[PDB]
């Protein structure tokens, strides 16, 4: 009747988790692939999309650390620090 969506599988194959464990602020994959948007994994990376300019990858520990790391300021989305766009 209703088909269910498949779960998330860590890119390194260490676990299979529902998609509510993806960016849920807890590290579930040894490669950090379930948390690309948070500071939860010690070896993850956050993508600075930097729309219009060169994209950059930063350490997960720099997501919501109160420091402006991406020129587009998207790494600071719930820290109190409001980053200005400095990509130009």
């Amino acid at each position: 009747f209703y088909e269910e969506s498949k779960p998330f599988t860590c890119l390194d194959g260490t676990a299979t988790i529902p998609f509510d464990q993806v960016n849920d602020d807890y590290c579930d994959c040894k490669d950090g692939s379930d948390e690309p948007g948070t500071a939860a994994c010690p070896n993850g990376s956050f993508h600075c999309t930097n729309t219009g300019y060169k994209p950059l990858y930063i350490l997960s520990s720099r997501v919501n650390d109160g420091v402006c790391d991406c020129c587009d300021g998207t790494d600071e989305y719930n820290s109190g620090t409001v980053c200005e766009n400095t990509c130009r």
Partner: peptide
């Protein structure tokens, strides 16, 4: 605090 960041101010709400 298992989320080691660049300074203690960065970690003090973790």
């Amino acid at each position: 605090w298992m989320r080691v960041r660049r300074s203690s101010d960065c970690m003090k709400d973790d």
